Scaffold this active site. Structure first.
Site, PDB file in Angstrom:
ATOM      1  N   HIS A  62     -25.140 -70.281 -77.877  1.00  0.00           N
ATOM      2  CA  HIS A  62     -24.054 -70.110 -76.835  1.00  0.00           C
ATOM      3  C   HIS A  62     -23.627 -71.328 -75.858  1.00  0.00           C
ATOM      4  O   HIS A  62     -22.555 -71.295 -75.569  1.00  0.00           O
ATOM      5  CB  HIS A  62     -24.789 -69.117 -75.609  1.00  0.00           C
ATOM      6  CG  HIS A  62     -25.425 -67.841 -76.190  1.00  0.00           C
ATOM      7  ND1 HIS A  62     -24.510 -66.897 -76.830  1.00  0.00           N
ATOM      8  CD2 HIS A  62     -26.574 -67.314 -76.390  1.00  0.00           C
ATOM      9  CE1 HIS A  62     -25.174 -65.896 -77.160  1.00  0.00           C
ATOM     10  NE2 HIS A  62     -26.581 -66.016 -77.015  1.00  0.00           N
ATOM     11  N   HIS A  92     -27.008 -77.012 -68.829  1.00  0.00           N
ATOM     12  CA  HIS A  92     -26.054 -76.746 -69.973  1.00  0.00           C
ATOM     13  C   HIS A  92     -24.369 -76.542 -69.456  1.00  0.00           C
ATOM     14  O   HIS A  92     -24.403 -76.747 -68.027  1.00  0.00           O
ATOM     15  CB  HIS A  92     -26.175 -75.403 -70.526  1.00  0.00           C
ATOM     16  CG  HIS A  92     -25.944 -74.259 -69.598  1.00  0.00           C
ATOM     17  ND1 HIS A  92     -26.847 -73.848 -68.530  1.00  0.00           N
ATOM     18  CD2 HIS A  92     -24.704 -73.427 -69.203  1.00  0.00           C
ATOM     19  CE1 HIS A  92     -26.349 -72.837 -67.810  1.00  0.00           C
ATOM     20  NE2 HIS A  92     -25.255 -72.578 -68.260  1.00  0.00           N
ATOM     21  N   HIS A  94     -20.203 -75.244 -70.198  1.00  0.00           N
ATOM     22  CA  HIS A  94     -19.230 -74.346 -70.702  1.00  0.00           C
ATOM     23  C   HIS A  94     -18.206 -74.929 -70.885  1.00  0.00           C
ATOM     24  O   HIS A  94     -17.444 -75.818 -70.055  1.00  0.00           O
ATOM     25  CB  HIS A  94     -19.047 -73.206 -69.591  1.00  0.00           C
ATOM     26  CG  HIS A  94     -20.161 -72.344 -69.095  1.00  0.00           C
ATOM     27  ND1 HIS A  94     -20.788 -71.121 -69.991  1.00  0.00           N
ATOM     28  CD2 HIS A  94     -21.160 -72.578 -68.610  1.00  0.00           C
ATOM     29  CE1 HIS A  94     -21.818 -70.709 -69.193  1.00  0.00           C
ATOM     30  NE2 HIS A  94     -22.294 -71.655 -68.419  1.00  0.00           N
ATOM     31  N   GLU A 104     -15.703 -71.749 -65.739  1.00  0.00           N
ATOM     32  CA  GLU A 104     -16.139 -70.658 -65.336  1.00  0.00           C
ATOM     33  C   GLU A 104     -15.592 -70.251 -64.031  1.00  0.00           C
ATOM     34  O   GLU A 104     -14.642 -69.439 -63.723  1.00  0.00           O
ATOM     35  CB  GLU A 104     -17.618 -70.219 -65.487  1.00  0.00           C
ATOM     36  CG  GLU A 104     -18.010 -70.316 -67.018  1.00  0.00           C
ATOM     37  CD  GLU A 104     -19.329 -69.505 -67.414  1.00  0.00           C
ATOM     38  OE1 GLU A 104     -20.370 -69.796 -66.428  1.00  0.00           O
ATOM     39  OE2 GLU A 104     -19.147 -68.825 -68.286  1.00  0.00           O
ATOM     40  N   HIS A 117     -23.689 -76.625 -65.554  1.00  0.00           N
ATOM     41  CA  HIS A 117     -24.688 -75.754 -64.628  1.00  0.00           C
ATOM     42  C   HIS A 117     -25.968 -76.459 -64.676  1.00  0.00           C
ATOM     43  O   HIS A 117     -26.610 -76.420 -65.876  1.00  0.00           O
ATOM     44  CB  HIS A 117     -24.554 -74.245 -65.228  1.00  0.00           C
ATOM     45  CG  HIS A 117     -23.447 -73.640 -64.927  1.00  0.00           C
ATOM     46  ND1 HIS A 117     -23.170 -72.493 -65.672  1.00  0.00           N
ATOM     47  CD2 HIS A 117     -22.285 -73.869 -63.945  1.00  0.00           C
ATOM     48  CE1 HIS A 117     -21.759 -72.042 -65.296  1.00  0.00           C
ATOM     49  NE2 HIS A 117     -21.411 -73.079 -64.243  1.00  0.00           N
ATOM     50  N   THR A 196     -24.010 -65.834 -65.293  1.00  0.00           N
ATOM     51  CA  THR A 196     -22.848 -65.939 -65.851  1.00  0.00           C
ATOM     52  C   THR A 196     -22.755 -65.307 -67.441  1.00  0.00           C
ATOM     53  O   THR A 196     -21.483 -64.964 -68.129  1.00  0.00           O
ATOM     54  CB  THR A 196     -21.724 -66.845 -65.599  1.00  0.00           C
ATOM     55  OG1 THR A 196     -22.017 -68.033 -66.771  1.00  0.00           O
ATOM     56  CG2 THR A 196     -21.578 -67.443 -64.289  1.00  0.00           C
TER      57      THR A 196
HETATM   58  N1  LIG Z   1     -24.452 -69.811 -67.031  1.00  0.00           N
HETATM   59  S1  LIG Z   1     -25.891 -69.331 -66.461  1.00  0.00           S
HETATM   60  O1  LIG Z   1     -26.325 -70.345 -65.997  1.00  0.00           O
HETATM   61  O2  LIG Z   1     -25.507 -68.196 -65.333  1.00  0.00           O
HETATM   62  N2  LIG Z   1     -26.828 -68.574 -67.679  1.00  0.00           N
HETATM   63  C1  LIG Z   1     -27.489 -69.499 -68.492  1.00  0.00           C
HETATM   64  C2  LIG Z   1     -28.982 -69.279 -68.802  1.00  0.00           C
HETATM   65  B1  LIG Z   1     -29.428 -69.767 -70.180  1.00  0.00           B
HETATM   66  B2  LIG Z   1     -30.794 -68.773 -70.764  1.00  0.00           B
HETATM   67  B3  LIG Z   1     -31.130 -70.185 -69.985  1.00  0.00           B
HETATM   68  B4  LIG Z   1     -31.976 -68.672 -69.484  1.00  0.00           B
HETATM   69  B5  LIG Z   1     -30.761 -67.428 -69.624  1.00  0.00           B
HETATM   70  B6  LIG Z   1     -29.235 -68.299 -70.351  1.00  0.00           B
HETATM   71  B7  LIG Z   1     -29.455 -67.790 -68.266  1.00  0.00           B
HETATM   72  B8  LIG Z   1     -29.979 -69.122 -67.437  1.00  0.00           B
HETATM   73  B9  LIG Z   1     -31.516 -69.707 -68.118  1.00  0.00           B
HETATM   74  B10 LIG Z   1     -29.902 -70.499 -68.523  1.00  0.00           B
HETATM   75  C3  LIG Z   1     -31.253 -68.091 -68.190  1.00  0.00           C
HETATM   76 ZN   LIG Z   2     -23.895 -71.578 -67.281  1.00  0.00          ZN
END
Ligand SMILES: [N]S(=O)(=O)[N][C]C1234B567B89%10B5%11%12B85%13B98%14B%1061B821B326B%115(B%12724)C%13%1416
Ligand SMILES: [Zn+2]
Length: 258
Positions: A62, A92, A94, A104, A117, A196
């Protein structure tokens, strides 16, 4: 039939597996700068990343995720709207297929080329998994990217992307300093929202910086060579991995600046 960003598994489908997608505090949102109100009750924001220890970079199908050692109080976000201490776990991005989209959050409906983010969890809850069962479990620091001059602090990330092209690939990524991804100003907007991506959990205090960072066209072009697919599978370029703006509902966006 896993979630993603395509026509048949994208954001308009997520609610079937994650009904919270239609919840009362979903992210991202459009930031209407005229309706956002300065909040004098906000304390100074503290971004303390001097002791951050990065571990690894991962393509999770992703995005690419730079992961940190969060077993001690090292890289922490405090102040602003936050009560207590939030520990950096990963970051990470987007981004878009074209420079005109990828973020976003939007600002008066403006889409930036990308959005960074930095994800943090509230240390009163002991671990990340427990934090994501709490309404104040997470704080995400969001930073917009525009295309212009290169961001020299990003280049180490860009240069390792060739080694994690496909879903499931990881590489060692130690000694990376996330201070080099920050703009000059910490002026920000803040509101309560959600992750998100699935699982779309409504745990997040969002802090979105007003000042974007500039990255070069060549830097962002390298983001767009990553693959959503795994090794040996048909190539689907990892582009447009952003969720669009969601209903603001019963929320107010507060500004740290007058
Ligand atoms: N764009 S976001 O930061 O809201 N989602 C990203 C995620 B990745 B995976 B890692 B774990 B899951 B997914 B969610 B947070 B952490 B970060 C958790
Ligand atoms: Zn994110």
């Amino acid at each position: 039939h896993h979630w993603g960003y395509g026509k048949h598994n994208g954001p308009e489908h997520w609610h079937k597996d994650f009904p919270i997608a239609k919840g009362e505090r979903q992210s991202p949102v459009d930031i209407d700068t005229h309706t956002a109100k300065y909040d004098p009750s906000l304390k100074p924001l503290s971004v303390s990343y001097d002791q951050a220890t990065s571990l690894r970079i991962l393509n999770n199908g992703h995005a690419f995720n730079v992961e940190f050692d969060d077993s001690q109080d090292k890289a922490v976000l405090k102040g602003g709207p936050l009560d207590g201490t939030y520990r950096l776990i990963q970051f990470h991005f987007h981004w878009g297929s074209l420079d005109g989209q990828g973020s976003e959050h939007t600002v008066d409906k403006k889409k930036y080329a990308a959005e960074l983010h930095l994800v943090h969890w509230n240390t009163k809850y002991g671990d990340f998994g427990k934090a994501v069962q709490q309404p104040d479990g997470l704080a995400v620091l969001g930073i917009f990217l525009k295309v212009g001059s290169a961001k020299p602090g990003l280049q180490k990330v860009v240069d390792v992307l060739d080694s994690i092209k496909t879903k499931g690939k990881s590489a060692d990524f130690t000694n990376f300093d996330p201070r080099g991804l920050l703009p000059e100003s910490l002026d920000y907007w803040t509101y309560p929202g959600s992750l998100t991506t699935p699982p779309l959990l409504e745990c997040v205090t969002w802090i979105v910086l007003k000042e974007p960072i500039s990255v070069s066209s060549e830097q962002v072009l390298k983001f767009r060579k990553l693959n959503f697919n795994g090794e040996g599978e048909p190539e689907e370029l990892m582009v447009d991995n952003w969720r669009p703006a969601q209903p603001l509902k019963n929320r107010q966006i507060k500004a740290s600046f007058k």
